[PDB]
Design a binder for this molecule. Sequence first.
Ligand SMILES: O=c1[nH]cc(F)c(=O)[nH]1
Ligand SMILES: O=c1[nH]cc(F)c(=O)[nH]1
Lengths: 287, 286
Amino acid sequence: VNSHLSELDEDVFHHFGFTTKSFDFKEKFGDVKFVCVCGSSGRIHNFAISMAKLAGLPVENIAGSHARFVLYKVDHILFADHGMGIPSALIMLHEVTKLLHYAGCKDVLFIRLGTSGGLGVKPGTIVLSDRCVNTKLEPYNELCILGKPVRRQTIVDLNTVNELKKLSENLSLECSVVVGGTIAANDFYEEQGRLDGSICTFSKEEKLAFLQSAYEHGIRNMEMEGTAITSHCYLTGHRAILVCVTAVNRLEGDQITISTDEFTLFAQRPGQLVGEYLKRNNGIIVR
Amino acid sequence: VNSHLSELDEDVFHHFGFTTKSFDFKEKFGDVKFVCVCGSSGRIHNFAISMAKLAGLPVENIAGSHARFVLYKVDHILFADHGMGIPSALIMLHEVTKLLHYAGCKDVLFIRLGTSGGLGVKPGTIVLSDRCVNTKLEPYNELCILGKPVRRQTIVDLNTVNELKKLSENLSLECSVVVGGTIAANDFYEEQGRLDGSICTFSKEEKLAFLQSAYEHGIRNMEMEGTAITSHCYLTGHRAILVCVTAVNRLEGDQITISTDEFTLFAQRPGQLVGEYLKRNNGIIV
Ligand SMILES: O=c1[nH]cc(F)c(=O)[nH]1
Ligand SMILES: O=c1[nH]cc(F)c(=O)[nH]1
């Protein structure tokens, strides 16, 4: 545990815009067993609204006025956004895991409901990550702490992934549910092998050798935070999974050509699976 | 210029929610000579609104409604947010610099208006970066492209920095303006030497040895995107500066203990200086 936290009279959650004196954390958050996250404040809000409807229950922002992130709560589930990229995700992760610790919450499941680029699967596919790796296909998150290199192993809650897959096989979703590996990259364009950024120093041949090699190593999609979420939660005593929809088949192209409406439809598909899971696993109270 | 863009009949700006077919880019953006950016959509909008008032001109969002980023324009200035951290900033950088390319804009100045942790300066101090380095004080942005390590030199437009410093002396700011080095970190907590994250593997003494050393190497503040902005712009034919206020003295602590109201006042100080600069040098029409 971080003993330095005891030195504080009050802990200011800078990016959520509240402090430990804002509410009673044990009373307020003590019953939380799940945290659902994604890059979009609007989308995670909508998801929380859907969970409230399922709970038979407005879903009001718990975060303060000038916060970078939103925070909602529906029964035993916390909802937060985390922007895009490992650094932004680590800001959310630090402050939410502190919150959870202060509330007395242990062994919480974090669920990332994101969007991603697919490898060898159709757009709209749900990929359940069975491992999260960097762009060198290594299951580690890399950090530089006090100027020194550190690596933290990525651990996916595989027992839960398998339960979700089994669940999906018994459901009627309008998409395939693929279990496979997930590359987290530190950019949307060049690090993801895109030819269509403002800069590109490689050929299509080199792009496809990179992506096809990843495919052969079991990778089925690519996003920007996976290695942060699945390394940090384990180290703070929690569990984590990634449930991402694909928005493009990167073996065919780079551009996101589907409509805004179609993208929104696709992005809601992880929530449709996960929502029923949460319902069956005491995420909400069925009223 | 990326030759592969000519392989697109249409170029979708995914995170801005429009396309090359959405506008006549030459007609709409051709006059842009400045891009002001920061992590907050609300704060960059308020700054654009302030520049609009200066120009004597509602500032409407140009980006799509379901977009990750906002985009505004006041005369020759473009405004956008970029979230927090290098990956997010790179997303804005690629799409905005493509936009400028399509619009025929050349030698544009990117201005990041951020907040930061200070080293040995008082909270509310404006730091003008005269270099942007990683946590090892190296003037490079690091990338892993097709799984291979790539480094890109950071280049701050120093001529503009010097002009800003000189300008600030002639203004009446309630703060000091310091030219100094800026560290970009891939985290707010552990990578910035904070003792107050959910994980900490070091002591107060190890924190202070690390930051005091950086101070001695001329670092005066610390944020999360400097190396991306100052390496990317140069390589795409543009210029870039960082103008960041400090919200805490990291040699004294980690927590941001100033009120939300004071933080907001502080966060507006970069725009106050930069706006005077843009007003003098053809950012707007008065
Ligand atoms: O990080 C990503 N998010 C969403 C995508 F569609 C993609 O290709 N990459
Ligand atoms: O990246 C940062 N932004 C703002 C701060 F106050 C800080 O310490 N670090």
